[PDB]
Amino acid sequence: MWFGEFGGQYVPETLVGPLKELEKAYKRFKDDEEFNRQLNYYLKTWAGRPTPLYYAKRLTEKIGGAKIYLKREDLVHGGAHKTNNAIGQAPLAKLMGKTRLIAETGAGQHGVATAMAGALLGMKVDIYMGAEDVERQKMNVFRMKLLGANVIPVNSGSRTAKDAINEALRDWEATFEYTHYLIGSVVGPHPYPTIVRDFQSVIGREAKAQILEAEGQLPDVIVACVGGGSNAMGIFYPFVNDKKVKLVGVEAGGKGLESGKHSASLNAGQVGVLHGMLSYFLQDEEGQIKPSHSIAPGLDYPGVGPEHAYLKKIQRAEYVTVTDEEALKAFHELSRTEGIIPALESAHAVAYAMKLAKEMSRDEIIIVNLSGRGDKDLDIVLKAS
Amino acid sequence: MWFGEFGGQYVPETLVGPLKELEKAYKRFKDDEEFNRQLNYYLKTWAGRPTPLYYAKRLTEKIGGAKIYLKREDLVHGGAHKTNNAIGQAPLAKLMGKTRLIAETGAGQHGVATAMAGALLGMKVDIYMGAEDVERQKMNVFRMKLLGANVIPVNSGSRTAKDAINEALRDWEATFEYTHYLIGSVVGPHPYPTIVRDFQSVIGREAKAQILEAEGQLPDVIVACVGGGSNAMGIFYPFVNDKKVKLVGVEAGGKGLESGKHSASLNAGQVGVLHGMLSYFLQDEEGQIKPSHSIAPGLDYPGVGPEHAYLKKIQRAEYVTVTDEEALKAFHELSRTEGIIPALESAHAVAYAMKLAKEMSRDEIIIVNLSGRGDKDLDIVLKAS
Ligand SMILES: Cc1ncc(COP(=O)(O)O)c(/C=N/[C@H](C(=O)O)[C@@H](O)C(C)C)c1O
Ligand SMILES: Cc1ncc(COP(=O)(O)O)c(/C=N/[C@H](C(=O)O)[C@@H](O)C(C)C)c1O
Ligand code: NA
Ligand code: NA
């Protein structure tokens, strides 16, 4: 339910029953040998796991400090870690007797991921997306449609990722009998933050085995970008009890924390209740939710997962910010130095890892979670350059 | 050098030296321990090999005939099989003392793969691309630029892949002391058809191992699209001596064979000499090259590699055609039924496999080489609907 004080389940009474059925179903299937055999089979033959752990030799040399390794989630089918969670949840939903998946999306990768999983499993897919956001990203929208999903434009409120979630909740409240709400990050009411973290934990489990094989030791630091926080929790979680391993989450500093135009919920947000959870959210002078911004569409959500709020509070993980410009520089840097075009979200982690590596020893090890590939971001980087 | 009567080394005398040096270096490093360790290390950690062999269960049961397996080259770093060859040749060039790579490209995937390999290894990269091709695969043009490569639009002749190759050869003739011409298919003068096939053979060796795991037997049919023929040779080659395995190469039928707008070199072409090889080319009455067409840009090359000419001649492989319409239907069908968006090139193979599976028994097995992902073709598919 809770991670310290954070998380919980603060929802209308109509959602309590559906959320309890989800908890029970998850508890039933999470360690079920057949459910996991089937999931691992899809992850292997369909999604292409395991993804490699790549030693970025040129980048490491150029920075002259710590060894920089990249966990290559950019190679997962669909081009992002989102698939790990989509193909975890969709078969669970099907086993619960659901025939329909709904989901929120902003960067469109979770929409695509959900559309892919739904196509694969023969389930109807309706994707809620802000009416401003659908015009912002025509590529992923067309991908979703090609996959057989329906993209519902949201014309209410600020018409963005936050309001896509708002519409999805109303839909789910009416349709939960046959509809699974496939949430795309470690946010929302219990049990979603736990479920999504569990399905993303494969990243960390692979990375740990891979770094022990490659270097014979655990890393000194793990760096991952944090929007809602799923890719970060995915790679963090299996190292949480390894006291030696520093965990650093990188939020979108946007145009600078002083500008207001950013998405640094942990660094500059306030604790509060939204979308069924207690966590950090960006808030105005009055105390109401405030719009966020980032050059990276996937980091443009005003809140953050409760397990990160918890890790911040107990000082198990450190959270930092990287600006639009620094992410853009890192995007170009990785492309030119390693031949890997990263997602703009992932570029935030790379940007911070580059600063961090500089002040560390050559014997030390950083693993950066490369949460996705940058093919989706080409028009954005073109305009920005 | 020769595959029966096809192949050879038909170049100006000025290129005979560098080709002999390339053949010598390849001979030296081909079975060398360190070269192969590096290559396998790059293929694993950077490119993400092995790629999975996926059982398209829903597609299979929908057609109601033979089992359809997909070899998932769409998941290789870069989005296509081209990377296998780029990362094979680029380090060989470095070992030979070269500091610059040049390459041709039509669909842009080989250009991207060459730019990625060059970036990784810190080499300069110039890509020759036909002006027509620049305008219709512009996503890959920007990827190349972001990777630090220079894209040189080719305006000569019909402004297509054939013309790009013409300019590349002339460049290489002047710059061979420091430049390696990284050819992207099993075409060109010896030793390129052999080298590219060798670096793509990893596809078939993996597929062989994977189908024995999944089914306990070799497949009944292997199906692959054929432009120049590299992805086909890659998956074909390790099964050539397994007599029971049928090998089917699928060429672009375009708007129809009788319409004259296609790229079916093996099926409709005549014997000829171009780009340093004796093979089959689409040729008019007065010994000139007909302009090829396909909805799939990567199949838009008027010729075909000499090893395919040979395999057809000895009837070891069968070569068929699929129209634009049929490939497009397969693109949509795969996307909706399996949640995999294929390259339009690969959709030709899928299209033929679907027709073939219907005519075959449910106990029989078809492996289709899914040579690439379809993110590059989203605009082309929009127009062809
Ligand atoms: C490549 C990539 N990297 C990082 C993120 C940030 O999500 P987290 O991993 O959950 O912090 C994302 C998030 N993308 C979502 C989407 O595709 O809609 C995001 O916009 C929504 C969860 C709000 C991403 O696509
Ligand atoms: C995804 C994909 N699938 C199939 C092909 C056909 O090339 P082969 O494998 O050499 O027959 C291609 C060929 N692409 C080349 C390129 O990307 O430049 C082609 O346009 C040129 C080598 C002519 C491809 O990109
Ligand atoms: Na946030
Ligand atoms: Na051809």
Query: Which residue, judged by its Cα, is nearest atom 13 of ligand 2?
Result: B298
- Give the position of tokens 């892949």: B161
CA atoms within 13 A on the CB side of A53: 24
Asked if residues A64 and A358 have their Cβ atoms less than 8 Å apart, the reply is yes
Q: What are phi and psi of B105, to 5 degrees?
A: -160, 150
> What's the length of chain A?
385
B341–chain A Cβ distance below 8 A for any pair: yes
Nearest-angstrom CA–CA distance, A334 and A56: 9
Give the whole-angstrom CA distance, residue A345 versus residue B223: 38
Nearest-CA distance from B20 to chain A in Å? 30
Task: Give every CB contact of residue A16 below 8 A, 6+ residues apart in sequence.
Answer: A9
CA distance to B19, B52, B163, B275, per residue, from B306 (Å): 17, 29, 19, 12
CA–centroid distance, B345 to ligand 2, in Å, is 8
> Cis link prior to A302 (omega < 30° from 0)?
no
What is the rounded CA–CA span in Å between residue A272 and residue A279? 6
Distance separating alpha carbons of residues B131 and B134, to the nearest angstrom = 5
- Terminal C-alpha separation, chain A: 45
CATH domain B48-81+201-385 topology? Rossmann fold (3.40.50)
DSSP helix/strand/coil, A262: coil
Query: Of ligand 1's atoms, which has the minimum distance to the CA of residue A301?
Result: 23
Asked whether A329 and A322 are in contact (CB, 8 A), the reply is no
Q: Is the CB of residue B78 less than 8 Å from the CB of residue A70? A: no
> Which residues contact ligand 2 via a Cβ below 6 A?
B 80, 82, 104-111, 161, 184-185, 225-232, 297-299, 301, 343, 345-346, 371-372
Query: How many beta-carbon pairs under 8 angstroms link A with B?
Result: 109
CB contact under 8 A, B52 and A58: no
Pocket of ligand 1 (CB under 6 A): A 80, 82, 105-110, 161, 184-185, 225-232, 297-299, 301, 343, 345-346, 371-372
Residue A263 Cα to ligand 3 middle (Å) = 5
Q: Which residues of A touch B53 (CB under 8 A)?
A: 45
Question: Residue A40, Cβ neighbours under 10 Å: how many?
Answer: 12
Task: Please list every residue in chain A followed by a chain break, i.e. its C lies more than 2.5 Å from the next written N.
Answer: none
d(CA B311, CA B111): 28
Whether residue B122 and residue A58 make contact (CB cut-off 8 A), yes or no, is yes
Cβ atoms B308, B6 nearer than 8 A: no
Q: Which of A375, A364, A204, A231 is closest to A307 using CA atoms?
A: A231
* CA of A267 vs chain B CAs: smallest distance (Å): 31
The answer to whether A50 faces chain B, any CB pair under 8 Å, is no
- Say if A19 is an interface residue toward chain B (CB within 8 Å): no
The answer to whether the Cβ–Cβ distance between B46 and A122 falls below 8 Å is no
User: B254 to chain A nearest CA, in Å?
Assistant: 22
| Cβ atoms A131, A74 nearer than 8 A | no
Q: Given A104, A167, A251, A345, which residue is catalytic?
A: A104
Resolution in A: 1.8
Contacts of A86 in chain B (CB under 8 A): none
Are B324 and B255 a contacting pair, CB within 8 Å?
yes
Q: What is the fold, at CATH topology level, of the domain defined by A3-47+82-200?
A: Rossmann fold (3.40.50)
Give the technique used to solve this structure: X-ray
C-alpha span between B165 and A284 (Å, rounded): 59
Contact A122, A100 (CB under 8 A): no
A337 by DSSP, 3-state: which?
Answer: helix
Judged by CB atoms closer than 8 Å, whether chains meet at A119 and B335 is answered as: yes
Dist. CA A12–CA A327, nearest whole Å: 39
Name the residue among A117, A148, A336 with its Cβ closest to that of B119: A336
User: CA–CA separation, A287 vs A270, rounded Å?
Assistant: 8
A381 touches chain B (CB under 8 A): yes
DSSP symbol at B303: B
Among residues B220, B154, B233, B163, the alpha carbon closest in space to that of B192 is found at B233
Side chain identity, residue B356: L
Residue B211 contacts residue B286 (beta carbons within 8 Å) = no
Residue of B67, B71, B73, B82 marked catalytic: B82
Active site residue B104: yes
CA B22/CA B27 separation, integer angstroms: 8
d(CA A352, CA A350): 5
Chain B residue with CA closest to A382: the answer is B142
| Structure tokens belonging to residue B306 | 């000499």
In DSSP notation, B72-98 reads EGGGSTTSBTHHHHHHHHHHHHHHTT-
The Å distance, Cα B260 to ligand 1 centre, comes to 47
B162 assigned to active site? no
Q: What share of chain B is helix, strand, coil (3-state, %, to 5)?
A: 50, 20, 30
What are the residue boundaries of the structural domains of chain A, listed by start?
3-47+82-200, 48-81+201-385
Closest residue in chain B to residue A142, using alpha carbons only = B378
- For residue A170, count CB atoms less than 10 angstroms from its CB and return exposed for 0-12, middle for 13-18, buried for 19 or more: exposed
Q: How far, in Å, is the centroid of ligand 1 from the Cα of A227?
A: 6
A245 in Cβ contact with A237 (< 8 Å): no
A230 is catalytic: no
Quick check: B45 and A52 CB within 8 A? yes
- In angstroms, the CA B207 to CA A121 distance is 25
Quote the Cα angle for A73-A78-A80, to 5°. 30
The token duo for B272 is: 């000829």
- Surrounding ion ligand 4 within 5 Å at CB are B 263, 265, 301, 304
**Contact call for B72 and A139, based on CB within 8 A:** no
Going by C-alpha positions, the residue among B80, B69, B158, B146 that lies closest to residue B113 is B80
In the block, tokens 């500008």 appear at A259
Confirm if B249 and B319 have CB atoms less than 8 A apart.
yes
From A67, A71, A82, A162, the catalytic residue: A82
Rounded to the nearest 10°, the torsion over CA A374, A375, A379, A384 is: 20
The four Cα atoms A107, B75, B50, B348 give a dihedral, to 10 degrees, of: 160
Task: Round to whole Å and give the CA distance between A32 and A158.
Answer: 42
- How far away is chain B from the Cα of A334, in angstroms, using its nearest Cα? 9
Which of A74, A117, A119 shows the shortest C-beta gap to B336? A119
DSSP designation for B269 = -
Those residues whose C-beta lies under 8 Å from the C-beta of residue A385, and which sit 6 or more positions away, are A328, A332
The three-state secondary structure class of B4 is coil
Q: From the CA of A82, give the closest atom in ligand 1.
A: 25
With an 8 Å Cβ cutoff, is A330 touching chain B? no
What is the distance between the alpha carbons of residues A348 and B33, in angstroms, rounded to a whole number? 38
- Start-to-end Cα distance in chain B: 44
- Chain A residue whose CA is closest to B76: A75
Task: Say if B122 is an interface residue toward chain A (CB within 8 Å).
Answer: yes
- Whether the domain at A3-47+82-200 and the domain at A48-81+201-385 fall into the same CATH topology: yes
